[PDB]
From Swiss-Prot, chain A:
GO terms for biological process: calcium ion transport; fertilization; flagellated sperm motility; sperm capacitation. GO terms for cellular component: CatSper complex; sperm flagellum. The keyword Calcium applies. The chain holds residues 235 to 374 of 588 of the full protein. Belongs to the cation channel sperm-associated (TC 1.A.1.19) family. One of its GO terms (molecular function) is calcium-activated cation channel activity. Residues 46-58 dip into the membrane without crossing it. This is Cation channel sperm-associated protein 2. The chain crosses the membrane at residues 4-26, 79-105. Its main location: membrane. The gene is Catsper2. Pore-forming subunit of the CatSper complex, a sperm-specific voltage-gated calcium channel that plays a central role in sperm cell hyperactivation. Controls calcium entry to mediate the hyperactivated motility, a step needed for sperm motility which is essential late in the preparation of sperm for fertilization. Component of the CatSper complex or CatSpermasome composed of the core pore-forming members CATSPER1, CATSPER2, CATSPER3 and CATSPER4 as well as auxiliary members CATSPERB, CATSPERG2, CATSPERD, CATSPERE, CATSPERZ, C2CD6/CATSPERT, SLCO6C1, TMEM249, TMEM262 and EFCAB9. HSPA1 may be an additional auxiliary complex member. The core complex members CATSPER1, CATSPER2, CATSPER3 and CATSPER4 form a heterotetrameric channel. It comes from the Eukaryota.
From Swiss-Prot, chain B:
Auxiliary component of the CatSper complex, a complex involved in sperm cell hyperactivation. pH-dependent Ca(2+) sensor required to activate the CatSper channel. Sperm cell hyperactivation is needed for sperm motility which is essential late in the preparation of sperm for fertilization. Associates with the CatSper complex via direct interaction with CATSPERZ, and senses intracellular Ca(2+). Together with CATSPERZ, associates with the CatSper channel pore and is required for the two-row structure of each single CatSper channel. GO terms for cellular component: CatSper complex; cytoplasm; sperm principal piece. The gene is Efcab9. Ca(2+) 2 binds at residues 149, 153, 160. It is found in: Cytoplasm; Cell projection, Cilium, Flagellum. GO terms for biological process: flagellated sperm motility; sperm capacitation; spermatogenesis. The lineage of its organism: Eukaryota, Metazoa, Chordata, Craniata, Vertebrata. This is EF-hand calcium-binding domain-containing protein 9.
Amino acid sequence: ALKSMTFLLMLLLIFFYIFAVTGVYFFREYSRSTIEGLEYNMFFSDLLNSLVTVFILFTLDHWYAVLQDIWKVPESSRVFSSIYVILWLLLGSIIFRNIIVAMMVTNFQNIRSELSEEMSHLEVQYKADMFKQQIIQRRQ
Amino acid sequence: MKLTPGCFLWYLYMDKIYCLLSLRNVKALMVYFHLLDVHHRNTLNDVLFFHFLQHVTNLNKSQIGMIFDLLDWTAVGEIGFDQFYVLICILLAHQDHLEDHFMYRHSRPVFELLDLDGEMNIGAANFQNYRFLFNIKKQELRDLFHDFDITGDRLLNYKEFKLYTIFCTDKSID
């Protein structure tokens, strides 16, 4: 399986890279604001913090609460930012989870396929062996 | 008798399967085997076999040990005189160009020498042992194995091996 992980892994990490670096300077006014009462401020502060928080969005834990904690930013009619992060989390999570489970069950499929063709070839060889045993017996 | 009827028939088969039957080749092989076997107990030690191989063919120690292990099917730690004669006939001055065709012709069964497992299937380890015994390129051996493995299960049947040997002999003759 991990040998078969060739291109999908770098596709996953490069989508992570592009989406994280896009979302760095999207909720910039979340961490860079003068609001005293906030507790998810550090999530969107640094580039490494951006990687960690978009990984959190990828894992999809408390995305509701993350969105309400970013709602303390002045709502600019949600025209670009909230739809961007929601689309990113949903698309990335479902597309990558689905693609990995699909390719893993495909790996199981061809494992069983090569196993079954091996037993079929063994059965064909056994039939040929038994037929040649009849041929040899009649040849004596 | 002329050194037993079994060896007489073996010499007759060798003369029928080879263009030249030489002169007292079996007698020279028996003399060398008697010289190697100090105790004359119809067996030779691994050290004596390695010394004889290094003195005659100048083979490597690992190659000599692998050849001795392949020849000693009984796994008793010793090599018999018949096994030593069979190995000498299989070598048959392997540096010669016609020796490659002689090895391609192999013997009457011409399958058990390659099939060390004996289950009518030759694996990658057996192919590597054959390529160590007789000089052949790794890429050429891989191509030959890929051509022989029609089913893709990496197993060589007796009929497929015989057909491949016949095709190789026909290509070499033509």
